[PDB]
Structures are given as C-alpha cells and as structure tokens.
Design an enzyme around this catalytic site. Structure first.
Site, PDB file in Angstrom:
ATOM      1  CE  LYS A 296       1.190   3.110   1.198  1.00 48.55           C
ATOM      2  NZ  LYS A 296       1.108   2.234  -0.008  1.00 48.55           N
ATOM      3  CG  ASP A 334      -1.820  -0.004   0.641  1.00 43.07           C
ATOM      4  OD1 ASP A 334      -1.040  -0.981   0.633  1.00 43.07           O
ATOM      5  OD2 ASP A 334      -1.455   1.150   0.334  1.00 43.07           O
TER       6      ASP A 334
END
Ligand code: NAP
Ligand code: DHK
Length: 500
Positions: A296, A334
């Site tokens: 990420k 997210d």
C-alpha cells in the site's frame, strides 16, 4: 493464435476403472478434453486398458506416458514406452504428448501412419526458470523442426514478471502453442490463455489432483475467473500482494464484471518487487490494480498522480491506468470502507500502523476522535503525530469503558488463526471491536470480543465497501452496492480458501 483456449483435465488415478470415472467427472465439470497420465497407472495392460479408456471416455483423449527423466513416473524400457503411445494413436487417441528429446525419432516412426483426427503434441519442461525471449524462440523452433503439430512449453516462474515472456510467445508464435508457467507466481499464465493465444490450459478435477504446481480447478476457471469470456480485447485487473492467495477480490470483481457485461477479468498477483512488476506490465492490457499487504505504501510512490485523500493518508490501495497517456493514478477506498463499517456498527484505539492503519487512523480523526498501538513503536509514534493522536503494543493489554478497538494488523489472518493482537481481559473495556482481517471472517479477536460482550464488526463489512468503490473506479460505472453484498454472501462465504 487461432481459437480460444481449451480446458484439459489431468487424469492420474492409479487404476483403469478409476480413470474411467475421472473422465466422466471431467465431462460433468465442463472440461474440453482429458490428459491420460499413463505413467501413474499401478497395473497397466496396454492393449486392453487403452481400448477401454478410448471406448468409455465422453471427451477427446490426450495420452501421455511421462518418463522419470522428464519429471514423470515411468521407469523401464524406452521402446516399450513408445510402443504404448503409438498403440494409443492406432486405437483412436485424439492426441499424444511426446517429449522433445525423442520427438524426432518418434514422429519418424509414424510417418504416413497418422490417422485423420490425430495430432502430435511435442513438449519441453523447464523446472528451473523462464528463459529469455531469445532462448524461448529457439526452443519453439527446435520443437517445430521435429514435425510437431502442436508446440508445448512449460517453464517455472521465479518472479511474476516472467509470465510476460510466455504471453509474448503464445501471442506471436505462428504455430499452435501450449505455453504455461508453473508455480504460484505463474498462475496468471494459466488463466489468461484466451487473451494471449494459448492453445490449451490444464484445470483439475479437484484441488488434490494436481499434475503440476499452480494448476487451478476446472470449476474455478469456468465460474470464478469466467474463462469462456476472456478474449484478446479483455482488460486485465488484479489484486497485488504478498501473500495474496487468501484474497477474495477475484471472486467479487469477476462476478460483478460478468453481471454488467464489462469486458474485464480479475486475477491474483503474487508480487515480490512492486517496482519491477509495474514496469513489466505497463501495457494497456493491464488497466488497474487493487493493492493489499504490504504494498500500500510502495503503491503510493509508484503512482504518477495521487488523489488528495490518498496523499493525506499516505497509502494507496487502488491503481488505475489512464488510457489517455498511460500513467498510473492512485486512490484509497480503505478509509471510507472501514469508517463507514464502524459507524454502521454503532476514542478509537487503532492496532497497527501500516497501510490499513494509516487510513483508519486518518478517517477516525476526520470524524472527531485516536490512539495508535503498534509492534514497531516508531511507526505508531510517527502516525500519532501525523494526525494528532502512540501506544506500545505491550501496553495495549492493560490500557474509558465505551471505547472502540480497530485491528489493522495481519495478526489472525489465515493460516495464523490463533494469533490475536490483544488479551481478552482488556476487551470488556470496549463497546465495539473491529477487525480488518476478513480471512477468516471471524478471527480469534472478534470471537473473544463477542465473548467479551462487545459489539463486533467483521472485516467483511469493510471488504465489500472498499470493493464496490474500486469497481466504480475501474469501470467508470456506478458502484452496484446491493450487487456486491449479494455476491459476497452467495459466492464469498467459504473459509480456508487459498488460490495458488
Ligand atoms: N477487509 C478489508 O477491507 C481490508 C483492508 C485493508 C487491510 N486489510 C487486512 O489488514 C491487514 C494489513 O494490511 P496492510 O496493507 O495494512 O499491511 P501493512 O503490511 O500495510 O500492515 C501490516 C501491519 O501488520 C504487521 N504485522 C505483522 N505481524 C504482526 C504481528 N505479529 N504483530 C503486530 N503487527 C504485525 C505490521 O507490524 P509492524 O508495523 O510492526 O511491522 C503492521 O502494523 C491484512 O491482513 C489485510 O488482509 C483488510
Ligand atoms: O483482495 C484483498 O484481500 C484486498 C484487501 C485490502 O487490502 C483492500 O484494500 C484491497 O483493495 C483488496
């Protein structure tokens, strides 16, 4: 090259009667043909047994009698082994696979004796790596020179970037070619055959009947990866991670693409080096990617443009390749996924300070209330000061009574099902407990929390939410929210699943 790829089922039962039953099951499952691995038969009476298989098989047959020197099980006289393959041809086999090393001699022995509906596959197996395009071309040429009807090359993936070379071979070689890359890192080579010109791919009857590393099941090829819908113009998407076998992104996105008839396919992408991966697959064929542990942060750096939200968070879980110029755009779904999931469930104690922790921390602050507890203190510290909120992973155990806990570490993720980031003695102090880990759905943490009397929010709630937002980013079509919830309930409920 030519027709879409066929699906062949390896048949390895140790008795003739069991092989007959397997060919039937292959038919039931949807396979196009079966590969009879004669070298796996315990007792074998050539004439009698070959006659039976050919007569009773509901699908076209391909016979292989693989010797120990080529990774097979056969040992003994070479001439006898060859007599069996010739016998198969005479009795009506649709194909036979003969090893490159002896293919010249073999094809000569059947000169002017080949039945009308019969093709000879000549194969080569590389159990070490995937050679350069230069060497692969030479291998194709050598096989063609034996008089083979179909060229078969199987290599080994040392890195996922290796697959690109095999696609170049199947896509451009002007001869029918079966090109596959073995190993988990080569799985993509087994799924996208119909887009890159592969003549055939192997699918298993079940997860335990594998004849080579990485083979998926026939069921998953047809129903999970939507094999029949893959073509030359299909756009490719995937979940980037390490590990990545636990991911259910391919389940939900492929179902959704099919439902709205979007010409796309989604696969697992086991990535070791993010930078080399993006460079190896920068063509317009690879339109977008989801990013999970532990890429990420690296994803954020590799993007040419980063959405304001992603930039302030410091992480990216969604990458889109603009058709215009061809650059990568980064987004983060997210945050909204975890925050909305928690709010719906109802001082936020965030466990973990990686990609997911950064997003959940950021969003928690935006709503008002934040404490960060992490194995590696420095990270929790850095994060705490970044959003104005640190706690040592050890002090978390004895750390109000209506607080909310949100785990964003990979503790508890399969196969580490008995790991938990905190003692159940501290749970009674929280009103709600959230866990990003969604495989399994119910982690040890959520379990002990449910037993602590607190309200729970499983990672699945966060997963579906961040997923439909990615769909919108990938396709440009309105997020079909209700659809994603239905797909997850119906197709994404099984546990202990590993796709590799
Ligand atoms: N369902 C969803 O929507 C969703 C979304 C995002 C993430 N997730 C899940 O949450 C997890 C993290 O993803 P990520 O991208 O943030 O990875 P990171 O790799 O980005 O985050 C990993 C974190 O766990 C690590 N860790 C590994 N073993 C640990 C241990 N034994 N004790 C404490 N920390 C440990 C790191 O600790 P250190 O910092 O000390 O190294 C860290 O805080 C994954 O399991 C993923 O499946 C689920
Ligand atoms: O497929 C998974 O496991 C995913 C997991 C999370 O990290 C999401 O942010 C990804 O987008 C998808």
């Amino acid at each position: 090259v030519k027709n879409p790829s066929l699906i062949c089922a390896p048949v390895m039962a140790d008795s003739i009667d069991k092989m007959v039953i397997e060919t039937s099951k292959a038919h039931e499952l949807g396979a196009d043909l079966v590969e009879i691995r004669l070298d796996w038969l315990k007792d074998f009476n050539p004439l009698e047994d070959l006659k039976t298989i050919i007569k009773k098989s509901p699908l076209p047959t391909l016979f292989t009698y693989r010797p120990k020197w080529e990774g097979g099980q056969y040992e003994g006289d070479e001439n006898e082994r060859r007599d069996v393959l010739r016998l198969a041809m005479e009795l009506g086999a649709d194909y036979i696979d003969v090893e490159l090393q002896v293919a010249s001699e073999f094809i000569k022995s059947i000169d002017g004796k080949k039945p009308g509906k019969f093709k000879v596959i000549v194969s080569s197996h590389n159990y070490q790596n995937t050679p350069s395009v230069e060497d692969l071309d030479g291998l194709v040429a050598r096989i063609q020179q034996t008089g083979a009807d179909i060229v078969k090359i199987a290599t080994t993936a040392v890195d996922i970037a290796d697959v690109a070379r095999m696609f170049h071979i199947t896509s451009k070689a002007q001869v029918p070619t079966i090109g596959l890359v073995m190993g988990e890192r080569g799985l993509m080579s087994r799924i996208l055959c119909s887009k890159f010109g592969g003549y055939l791919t192997f699918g298993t009857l079940d997860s335990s009947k594998v004849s080579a590393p990485g083979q998926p099941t026939i069921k998953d090829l047809l129903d999970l990866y939507n094999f029949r819908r893959i073509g030359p113009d299909t756009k490719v998407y995937g979940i980037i991670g390490k590990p990545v076998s636990h991911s259910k992104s391919p389940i939900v996105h492929n179902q959704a693409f099919k439902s709205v008839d979007f010409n796309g396919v989604y696969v697992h992408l086991l990535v070791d080096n993010l930078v080399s991966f993006l460079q190896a697959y920068s063509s317009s064929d690879f339109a977008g990617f989801s990013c999970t542990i532990p890429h990420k942060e690296a994803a954020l750096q590799c993007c040419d443009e980063v959405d304001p939200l992603a930039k302030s968070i410091g992480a990216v879980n969604t990458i889109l390749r603009r058709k215009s110029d061809g650059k990568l755009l980064g987004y983060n779904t997210d945050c909204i996924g975890s925050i909305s999931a928690i709010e719906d469930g109802l001082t936020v104690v965030v466990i973990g300070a990686g990609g997911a922790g950064k997003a959940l921390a950021y969003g928690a602050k935006e709503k008002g209330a934040v404490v960060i507890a992490n194995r590696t203190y420095e990270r929790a510290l850095e994060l705490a000061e970044a959003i104005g909120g640190a706690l040592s992973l050890t002090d978390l155990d004895n750390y109000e009574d209506g607080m909310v806990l949100a785990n964003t570490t990979s503790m508890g993720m399969q196969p580490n099902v008995e790991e938990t980031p905190i003692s159940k003695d501290a749970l009674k102090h929280y009103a709600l407990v959230f866990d990003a880990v969604y495989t399994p759905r119910i982690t040890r943490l959520l379990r002990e929390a449910e037993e602590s009397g607190a309200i729970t929010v499983s990672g699945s709630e966060m997963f579906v939410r961040q997923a439909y937002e990615q769909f919108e980013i990938f396709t440009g079509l309105p997020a079909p929210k209700e659809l994603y919830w239905q797909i997850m309930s119906k197709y994404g409920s099984r546990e202990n699943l590993y796709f590799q």
